[PDB]
Amino acid sequence: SNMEKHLFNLKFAAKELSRSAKKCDKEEKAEKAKIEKAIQKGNMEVARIHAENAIRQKNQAVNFLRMSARVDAVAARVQTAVTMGKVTKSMAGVVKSMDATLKTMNLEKISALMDKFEHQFETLDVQTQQMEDTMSSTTTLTTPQNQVDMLLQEMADEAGLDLDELSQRLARLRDQ
Amino acid sequence: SNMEKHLFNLKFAAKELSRSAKKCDKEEKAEKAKIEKAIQKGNMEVARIHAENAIRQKNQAVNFLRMSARVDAVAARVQTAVTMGKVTKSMAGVVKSMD
């Protein structure tokens, strides 16, 4: 917002002062060279004006550099403020959202919903067990127990690891 | 929703503070070099202003890094909250469906 553009202007003026100090420095160099090339010809006043001009350029350069450092510090502070303000705004937003959510989805509602989830899936387990029993009862002729037992015993002996008269006697007891 | 965009803004400001700290660090390096190249010419005040500027850059950099860490932690917490909220919504949905 306004603070952001003002910060931009501050940093702009800072780097402007910086580049102006650099400009004054190079102008100081140029004047120092001009005084060199002028004093050779025996001009004392020209050299004097060139010298004072160079000194002025140097002084103004250091002043501009000091001002630029100050403004850079101020702009950095303002940048800190702007970023912190954005963070504060976002934190307020999430605070409002969390308030709404928690008020809607409270802890009690959560607990109840989770208990309902648990009981529902327990009931689903019961359903699965019911279907297990039925499917095991139905497909029983095509999947005897003795056959699978013999296969397991044989394949265990192979892989190398250990793990009718009954009904007739029950019939005897029934007859008794 | 609003919480998601606010989280995005938080993480944006976090990485912004991070890159700003890096910028301040490189500016500190530049100022330290400028003071080196300036003290050779016998300028004491220029060196002084450059030095204090560099110290300010360093301090502001560490401050920005601390703030960035804090905001990153907060944004991570908010991300946890957002994800947990999505999970809760989905669990409620499947609860209704199963019911």
Add this chain to the structure above:
Amino acid sequence: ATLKTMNLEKISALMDKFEHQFETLDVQTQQMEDTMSSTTTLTTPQNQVD
């Protein structure tokens, strides 16, 4: 303008609210931890993982 609007007292209150809200969120997470650990217990025994 900002400080007059967003004062220090308002900041403190808002931050305390943030803190308490996320503590409540921790409680919620713990509640869900307990439930999810209780539910998926047959498929995740303790002896086996040990």
Add this chain to the structure above:
Amino acid sequence: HAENAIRQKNQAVNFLRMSARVDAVAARVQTAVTMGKVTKSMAGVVKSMD
């Protein structure tokens, strides 16, 4: 990680048991469908022969 792995193993064996059951049921239904097609064809040829 360990409990997650144990849960994956248990759920895998459960899914395999369920898959075997459903495969048996689907095989039974396939038997029924084929037998029904055969019955329909036999009825057709019965009508034609009649």
Add this chain to the structure above:
Amino acid sequence: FKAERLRVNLRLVINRLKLLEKKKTELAQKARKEIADYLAAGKDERARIRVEHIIREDYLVEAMEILELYCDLLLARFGLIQSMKELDSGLAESVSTLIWAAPRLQSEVAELKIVADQLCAKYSKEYGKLCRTNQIGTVNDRLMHKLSVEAPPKILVERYLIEIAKNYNVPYEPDSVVMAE
């Protein structure tokens, strides 16, 4: 009244006093150099008034430290004072000193004024715009002297000058008339 407002403002005053103490310390350290420089250039009375500013600022710092101590004590016993209607013997000094210093530091810190107001609107026995003026006659004497407005003794100023000249490695001829008395 609102109690949470008082609590929050107390915490804020504590933090603000901490920061201001650190800042005043830095400024004093930076101004002692200027005082030394003025001493190293003939000017003596000028540096004298400067060190007068310094000692006044340091008294302010000490007063702020004591005030922070009392504010933290009040923040601790908040639970106790929030229930009782009449203050106890332990909080009497703190409350009196704080209410007396509020208008003194109202410029540097603002929350202190709000704290004083909350305490005034909270109590009624010898409390008010006029009752407080008479019931604040039990404030800390040390802080009262530190925060007072009076020209410090010239001997103390001369000693400060002597020391500041010694540390900064510069000469200084203290007036014997002051060093004697």
